[PDB]
Design a binder for this molecule. Structure first.
Ligand code: CDL
Ligand code: PLX
Ligand code: PLX
Ligand code: PEE
Ligand code: PEE
Ligand code: PEE
Lengths: 105, 113, 114, 303, 70, 129, 83, 98, 347, 99
């Protein structure tokens, strides 16, 4: 099946592209560098089953960074409630959200 | 026959030498420009941090005002289990702002030609 | 899970540097040479803390130091600097190569005065 | 004030390709020991207007049995590509400043063959289809060498930006750095636009003619910018505009001269010429131009 | 004689003179008498936005000089 | 906001895919494929990947679909997933793509060998006999 | 030796394009390993600052790291200026 | 998961269904395969650019190259079929049967 | 074709399979699959004829569809977890689609339809290579992700494959179609033990490869394609018919022959996981394979079919080319039961 | 946005001019009265496609020159171009470029 020639010879044929946080050119960081680093360090040398059971918090944070489903849900809820209130007329946006603010450098 | 080839090769060599000198000068000018940018960076970083924090604070104030009636809402609740600082998305800053600056922030660099 | 903490708007109030990008680029080299210590302290703090909320004081310090630098420039070498940054501003790419003459005048003036 | 800029870039190009026909007739006539059109108007100046009026008032010979859809689509695509292939060009400030201008020009030039293919397919004739197939094969074959030469030359520029080509050739023309690539590029542009010695072949006909001549002028302006750089003073762009226009006109006159001074190739002869004389030399010179900046430590700046 | 070809060519020259300078002039008129700022690499775009926010008129070409430093 | 321009382009992409998926008159299905490819390149360019979009528009449309048409004729919600910081004084996509020669030596080797074997295979198949 | 020279003379006739292409390709392959300026090109590429140089934290045992840009310690680009 | 990814996967599924429908004209089958490939390219490009996975920017180009090669191969086979039958109808390939 | 070109294409096929097996990146695995498919097509078309062309185009269509499905699964897995390494799939939909892609590549039912026709159209040499070598990459990939595969899908596909192979083998007369259905049934047997023990999968793969290599070499030695052409063999080389009958009995699972080792062992493993109904069903189904193997043996060796006069001339000429490793293949496929525990070598 | 406006203007102008040229002569009433399949064309099309793919591989060279791994980048670029040349040579010697 998997004949690990690379680890036997220390060649690094294709291991540099496997993860986001592995020696990017000009040290350009990935969007989720910190979360991936945390999860990788949590799950190293632990085994698949134990990594799945024990490092679930880090993987959940990593997936949240990748897809941001919960952030989208929260923003959508806030926007919908604001729209409902502005339809009923009990809420008025501040000048900052109307373009009348004073911008800063 | 030999003269034509000699003339061509001489022109090639002269062009190569001139381009070598000019390209080295361009390298030096590029390094100078990059050093100017490096010198100017920290002020821009400080201003960016201040602007991001102010936008987040304004969004938090508006969330506190709006979410007052929602029963189970916790104002300013993080969605990450960790307490580490997380860079906000475009939507986390410009979520409640007007649409024109939303478009500017998300598309100005790509659309500027 | 948890509540994020954000500094109050009174903590983010500081005297902004209200000069344009071309003006900043004109004096970028002298600004980097003279104002190096607060800038380096702020940038090291930014890279070590990995948190914008833990580096507000250094940001205020770098703003104040830049304002002091520009006040000195305004006090001593206002006119050569004005010509230099006008020339830098005219170009689309804001190239230093265009007007080395004005740069030389500004450099000699600021070496004479400060 | 952007639509004004687009119109002021479009209309003069159409007028230029209108008067290019008159200029070509005059040049060929005087090279053939005669005069060109000199009866209509002062010196033939009114000839293009008369030709356009005659073409637009003549009944079209629609086959009435082919696919009208592609028949009307093909001139649209040809003219649209010919007009849109002018906007990246810096003279000296491009209308639309793009980082990857050269790749955009290459992509549009590659798309240009769809008009030929669709016109041949919708012509509803086996002979027209065969002619379209030969034209398509020739165009794609020569565009391969066009692309290779373009990247090999740009290796000394630093990036794909067209404006930077003005900065690279500030002190010396790129004609001296690499003349063999320039000559092969000139022949490739001749063969791409179906011009002698490579021209084997009312309304839509005029559409296609304008598209072809606009492509001629575009290719020549691109060659002038790429290989014959002009000094650019930021405080007076009129000097650069005049120099660039003069070089483009010189190259167009050279095109007409070459058409008037040579016989024409066969199809197999030109295919052999490309595949067995240009491509090996193109690969060798591309390797040489890859290796040269590293050899001489003269890598161009931008990245 | 041969110089009779010159008129028509001249017209083409004019028809090729019109675009270039036109753009240049527009690029000045819309941008306060200066060259249009090019923005590659996404760092110069941040500079343009900073100038736009600094100016107070919402135009980047309005340059606030040293007189604004108080 | 531009009526969800990313969503408009995605819907037009889906419409073109439906149009050419019915497989009517393979030349017309081809035309639908060019339309869909142009829309997809528009999506990629709008997102920010200029080089990859131009790569599609050059390779795919200019060469590969053109060869397809040649052979046929011979026969009978958004804007929220984006970033916050800047890319510096370069384009990240161009640097990552140009890292093919300094990092991806293995990828270059295998792709070149595959292309050479593809040439050999095409010659062997089309030889006939 | 004689056969190789005769073959080269034969190829230079009736096939100059292939001879020129092979000569240029061979030169482009061979020459960079001999040119002394390639290390200069590598050094020039290395000396271009693309990212902000993050300062190190002082601990009193860094004599080679300058405390100010003007200080003599650190790499110098005088060789590039002389080029 | 935003609507753009959903639309791209929907396009891929539609192209797969078109490939598997098989009315006639094997050229249409090849066109459906290449539509699936184009959808794959778009989706991968969006995913890689969104997360700033810099070193993965190589992946689309490589993909495209290989896929295009396959297309070429497929076309060759199609040609031979026509050269044996005079036309490329799918129903003509019925000599071999289970 | 030219011998050098044929050798180069064979090296490229083997290199693609090796790249699939030795790589830890999904993109590199997909590249290996593409290289294998690209170089495998001319091997089918070495003897040009309409049947070979049709078989090659069917194979190309199926493999291209499978590769596209595999790439889509890789894309979804990357989307839901930014990982390129071949490990736990981290997504149910991606795992399902990748399982279908690998089933298409392998030939498991209901994606089995292409195997009999492709085997029938192409030659014996091409068929031998396709039947044994092709299985190594998809099986390695499946073994590498066996901890994530859904047992229901794999088990039902394996059961369907065994049923379909057993039923379809009864009707066929041509030997190549019989071999195709035999391969389908053997892969149904082999993929059923993937969720439990991959070592049993590898052992069954090795035993099946040895048996089918021996049988295909015997069929090439006595140039017979249909059943009657094989029946004529006894008049010239009776030893070949006897060895072929012994190998056929081995392939049916009859003890103490080697072909009994996998099935038995596989059953044992599924009995350790309290799976009792399924092994019984697969055994009673493999009885059908045994039946049509026995019919072939009756036709070939155990009875003497009528001969032809011209066969006399074939008595005077000897087989000029001898294929090495045929006796070794026969011995390894018939008399290696007593060394069953060597499977602990994690072969 | 600017490029979209430019493309729309170009297409609109071309379409308007084409339709007016098609319809201006239509106002005035008037009388109003295969097998071959050459293989060489397909072969040249396929060769162009494959060389286009190799050019697509070669394209990022202008940015590949600034890597500090000049030896490795140079080796890889020359390897790609050598493989392109070898493919052309194989096509040449086996009579793949004949009409
Ligand atoms: C566990 C692992 C399981 C392995 C899976 C099964 C492997 C079967 C595939 C092997 C290739 C098939 C084959 O050789 O023919 C079938 C062959 C039957 O022989 P045949 O029918 O007489 O051959 C007819 C060929 O078509 C006649 O071919 P030809 O006329 O073109 O002659 C060319 C010949 C001669 O080769 C040469 O000319 C050498 C020149 C070298 C050129 C250098 C170029 C490199 C760049 O080269 C070959 O035949 C292919 C050899 C490839 C090298 C493999 C290492 O049966 C076997 O080879 C059985 C192999 C034993 C099992 C594998 C090892 C034991 C475990
Ligand atoms: C080792 C076994 C040799 C015999 C078996 C060969 C099996 C098939 C041949 C293919 C295997 C060749 C191994 C090449 C692996 C590439 C990685 C290794 O070579 O290191 C590279 C060294 O590069 C070398 O120059 C590779 C050159 C090899 C390519 C030239 C010939 C290849 C031919 C292989 C067969 C292809 C078809 C046949 C062609 C004749 C990396 O360079 P480095 O700078 O440290 O790292 C850069 C990354 N950073 C930025 C993180 C530091
Ligand atoms: C008929 C039965 C099959 C016979 C097969 C042919 C026999 C001849 C093969 C010649 C030797 C085979 C291998 C050559 C030795 C060097 C290779 C060695 O390094 O490989 C090791 C492994 O060695 C081989 O696996 C063992 C080969 C022995 C096969 C015989 C077992 C058959 C059992 C039942 C029949 C009894 C024998 C009958 C006579 C041969 C490395 O193992 P490792 O990389 O860490 O793990 C990879 C596997 N994983 C991924 C699943 C974990
Ligand atoms: C039709 C194809 C035209 C699109 C080609 C655009 C190429 C290009 O480079 O433009 C990118 C440009 C700026 O990017 P950079 O040049 O890299 O500079 C950024 C920093 N200033 O970005 C944009 O174009 C933004 C607008 C994108 C949305 C619209 C794009 C065009 C979509 C056309 C869809 C219709 C196609 C029809 C099919 C064609 C049939 C033959
Ligand atoms: C010390 C290191 C130096 C590095 C080496 C670099 C030096 C290289 C020296 C040689 C380079 C010369 C390459 C030039 C291109 C070669 C093209 C070629 O050879 O093809 C011709 C064919 O070319 C043509 O005939 C094309 C004619 C097309 C009509 C155009 C007529 C030319 C007149 C127009 C002037 C050209 C303008 C060029 C400048 C353009 C300005 C932008 C030969 O073909 P055949 O005669 O059939 O022979 C092959 C069979 N044995
Ligand atoms: C190791 C470097 C390789 C990379 C550099 C070259 C890259 C690109 C160039 C090669 C492209 C492909 C070449 C394909 C070769 C095909 C050969 C062939 O078959 O052509 C022969 C003819 O070619 C030959 O004669 C054999 C090869 C010709 C010479 C080859 C090279 C000779 C030596 C080169 C080096 C010279 C010495 C160096 C001098 C240095 C300066 C002092 C048949 O002629 P036809 O055109 O088919 O017939 C038409 C007329 N009826």
């Amino acid at each position: 099946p998997f004949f690990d020639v690379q680890k036997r010879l220390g060649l690094d044929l294709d291991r540099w592209m496997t993860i986001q946080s592995a020696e990017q050119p000009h040290k350009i960081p990935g969007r989720c560098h910190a979360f991936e680093k945390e999860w990788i360090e949590c799950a190293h040398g632990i085994g698949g089953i134990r990594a799945e059971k024990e490092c679930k918090i880090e993987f959940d944070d990593f997936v949240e960074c990748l897809l941001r489903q919960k952030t989208m849900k929260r923003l959508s809820a806030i926007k919908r409630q604001r729209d409902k209130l502005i339809k009923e007329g009990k809420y008025t946006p501040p000048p900052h959200h109307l373009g009348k603010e004073d911008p800063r450098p | 026959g030999y003269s034509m080839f000699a003339v061509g090769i001489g022109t090639l060599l002269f062009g190569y030498w001139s381009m070598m000198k000019w390209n080295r000068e361009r390298r030096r000018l590029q390094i100078e420009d990059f050093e100017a940018r490096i010198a100017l960076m920290p002020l821009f970083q400080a201003e960016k941090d201040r602007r991001v924090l102010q936008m987040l604070r304004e969004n938090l104030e508006e969330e506190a005002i709006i979410m007052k009636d929602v029963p189970d809402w916790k104002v300013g609740e993080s969605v990450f289990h960790t307490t580490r600082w997380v860079t906000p998305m475009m939507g986390e800053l410009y979520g409640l702002r007007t649409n024109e600056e939303i478009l500017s922030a998300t598309y100005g660099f790509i659309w500027y030609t | 899970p948890g509540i994020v903490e954000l500094p109050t708007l009174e903590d983010l109030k500081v005297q902004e540097v209200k000069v344009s990008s071309s003006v900043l680029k004109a004096a970028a080299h002298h600004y980097g040479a003279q104002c190096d210590k607060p800038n380096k302290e702020f940038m090291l703090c930014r890279w070590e803390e990995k948190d914008p909320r833990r580096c507000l004081e250094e940001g205020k310090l770098v703003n104040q130091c830049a304002l002091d630098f520009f006040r000195q420039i305004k006090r001593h070498c206002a006119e050569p600097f004005t010509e230099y940054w006008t020339c830098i501003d005219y170009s689309g790419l804001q190239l230093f190569r265009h007007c080395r003459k004005q740069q030389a005048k500004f450099d000699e003036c600021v070496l004479d005065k400060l | 004030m952007f639509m004004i800029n687009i119109l002021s870039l479009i209309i003069p190009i159409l007028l230029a390709v209108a008067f290019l026909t008159l200029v070509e007739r005059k040049v060929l006539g005087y090279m053939q020991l005669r005069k060109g059109p000199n009866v209509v108007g002062p010196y033939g100046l009114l000839q293009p207007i008369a030709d356009a009026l005659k073409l637009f008032t003549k009944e079209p010979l629609r086959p009435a049995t082919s696919s009208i859809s592609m028949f009307i689509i093909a001139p649209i695509l040809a003219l649209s590509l010919a007009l849109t292939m002018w906007v990246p060009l810096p003279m000296p400030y491009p209308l639309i400043n793009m980082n990857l201008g050269v790749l955009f020009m290459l992509a549009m030039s590659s798309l240009a063959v769809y008009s030929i293919l669709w016109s041949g397919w919708a012509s509803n004739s086996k002979y027209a289809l065969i002619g379209a197939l030969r034209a398509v094969a020739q165009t794609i074959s020569y565009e391969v060498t066009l692309a290779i030469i373009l990247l090999s030359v740009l290796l000394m520029n630093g990036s794909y930006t067209l404006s930077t080509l003005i900065t690279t050739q500030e002190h010396i023309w790129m004609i001296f750095t690499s003349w063999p690539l320039a000559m092969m590029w000139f022949i490739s542009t001749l063969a791409e636009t179906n011009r002698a010695p490579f021209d084997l072949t009312a309304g839509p006909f005029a559409m296609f003619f304008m598209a072809e001549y606009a492509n001629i002028i575009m290719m020549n302006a691109f060659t002038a910018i790429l290989f014959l750089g002009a000094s650019h003073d930021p405080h007076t762009p009129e000097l650069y505009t005049i120099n660039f226009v003069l070089k483009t006109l010189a190259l167009t006159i050279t095109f007409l001269w070459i058409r008037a001074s040579y016989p024409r190739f066969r199809y197999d002869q030109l295919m052999h010429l490309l595949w067995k004389s240009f491509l090996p030399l193109t690969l060798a010179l591309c390797m040489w131009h890859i290796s040269l900046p590293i050899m001489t430590a003269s890598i161009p700046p931008q990245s | 004689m041969w110089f009779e070809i010159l008129p028509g060519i001249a017209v083409m020259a004019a028809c090729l003179f019109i675009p270039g300078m036109a753009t240049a002039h527009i690029h000045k008129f819309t941008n306060g008498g200066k060259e249009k700022r090019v923005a590659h690499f996404s760092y110069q775009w941040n500079l343009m936005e900073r100038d736009r926010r600094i100016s107070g008129v919402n135009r980047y070409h309005v340059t606030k000089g040293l007189e604004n430093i108080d | 906001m531009t009526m969800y321009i990313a969503f408009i382009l995605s819907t037009i992409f889906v419409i073109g895919f439906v149009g050419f998926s019915s497989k009517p008159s393979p030349i017309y299905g081809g035309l639908g494929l060019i339309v869909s490819g142009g829309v997809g390149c528009g999506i990629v360019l709008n997102f920010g990947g200029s080089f990859l979009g131009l790569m599609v528009f050059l390779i795919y449309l200019g060469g590969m679909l053109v060869v397809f048409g040649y052979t046929t004729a011979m026969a009978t919600g958004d804007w929220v997933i984006y970033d916050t910081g800047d890319s510096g004084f370069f384009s990240e996509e161009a640097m990552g793509i140009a890292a093919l020669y300094s990092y991806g030596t293995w990828l270059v080797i295998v792709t070149g060998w595959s292309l050479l074997i593809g040439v050999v295979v095409i010659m062997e198949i089309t030889r006939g006999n | 030796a004689g056969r190789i020279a005769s073959f080269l003379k034969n190829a230079w006739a009736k096939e100059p394009v292939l001879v020129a292409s092979f000569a240029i390709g061979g030169l482009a392959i061979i020459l960079p390993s001999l040119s002394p300026y390639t290390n200069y090109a590598i050094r020039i590429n290395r000396a271009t600052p693309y990212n902000y140089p993050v300062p190190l934290r002082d601990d009193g045992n860094m004599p080679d790291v300058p405390s100010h840009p003007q200080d003599p310690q650190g790499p110098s680009l005088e060789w590039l200026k002389n080029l | 998961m935003p609507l753009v990814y959903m639309n791209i996967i929907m396009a891929f599924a539609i192209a797969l269904a078109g490939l598997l429908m098989y009315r006639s004209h094997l050229m249409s089958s090849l066109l459906c395969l290449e539509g699936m490939m184009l959808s794959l390219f778009i989706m991968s490009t969006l995913i890689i650019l969104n997360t700033h996975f810099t070193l993965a920017n190589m992946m689309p180009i490589i993909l495209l190259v290989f896929a295009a090669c396959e297309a070429a191969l497929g076309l060759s086979l199609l040609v031979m079929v026509s050269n044996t039958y005079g036309t490329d109808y799918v129903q003509n390939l019925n000599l071999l049967q289970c | 074709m030219n011998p050098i070109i044929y050798t180069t294409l064979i090296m490229t096929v083997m290199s693609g399979t090796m790249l699939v097996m030795i790589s830890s990146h999904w993109l590199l695995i997909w590249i290996g699959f593409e290289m294998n498919l690209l170089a495998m097509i001319p091997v089918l078309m070495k003897n040009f004829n309409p049947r070979a062309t049709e078989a090659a185009t069917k194979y190309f269509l199926t493999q291209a569809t499978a590769s596209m499905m595999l790439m889509m699964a890789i894309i979804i897995n990357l989307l839901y977890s930014g990982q390129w390494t071949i490990t736990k799939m981290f997504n149910p939909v991606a795992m399902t689609m990748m399982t279908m892609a690998l089933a298409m590549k392998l030939g498991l039912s209901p994606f089995h339809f292409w195997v009999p026709e492709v085997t029938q159209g192409i030659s014996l040499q091409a068929g031998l290579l396709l039947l044994t070598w092709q299985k190594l990459a998809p099986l390695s990939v499946l073994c590498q992700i066996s901890q994530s595969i859904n047992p229901n899908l794999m088990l039902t596909m394996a059961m369907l494959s065994i049923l379909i192979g057993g039923w379809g083998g009864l009707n066929q007369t041509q030997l190549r179609k019989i071999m195709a259905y035999s391969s389908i049934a053997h892969m149904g047997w082999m993929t059923a033990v993937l969720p439990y023990n991959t070592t049993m999968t590898i052992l069954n793969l090795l035993i099946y490869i040895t048996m089918t290599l021996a049988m295909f070499m015997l069929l090439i030695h006595s140039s017979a394609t249909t059943t009657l052409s094989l029946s004529h063999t006894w008049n010239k080389m009776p030893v070949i018919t006897s060895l072929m009958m012994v190998t056929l009995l081995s392939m049916g699972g009859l003890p103490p022959l080697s072909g009994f080792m996998p099935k038995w062992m596989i059953i044992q493993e599924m009995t350790k996981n309290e799976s009792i109904i399924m092994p019984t069903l697969m055994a009673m189904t493999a009885l059908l394979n045994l039946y049509f193997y026995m019919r072939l043996a009756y036709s070939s060796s155990l009875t003497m079919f009528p001969s032809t006069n011209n066969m006399k001339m074939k008595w005077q000429f000897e087989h000029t080319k001898q294929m090495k490793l045929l006796p070794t293949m026969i011995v390894l496929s018939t008399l290696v039961l007593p060394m069953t525990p060597a499977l602990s070598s994690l072969n | 946005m600017n490029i979209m406006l430019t493309l729309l203007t170009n297409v609109t102008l071309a379409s308007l001019l084409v339709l007016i040229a098609f319809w201006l002569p239509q106002l005035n009433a008037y009388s109003e009265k295969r097998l071959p399949f050459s293989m060489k064309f397909f072969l040249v099309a396929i060769t162009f496609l494959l060389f286009d793919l190799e050019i697509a591989l070669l394209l990022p060279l202008p940015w590949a020159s600034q890597t500090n791994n000049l030896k490795t980048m140079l080796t890889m670029a020359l390897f790609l171009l050598i493989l392109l040349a070898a493919s052309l040579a194989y096509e040449w010697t086996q009579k793949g470029l004949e009409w």
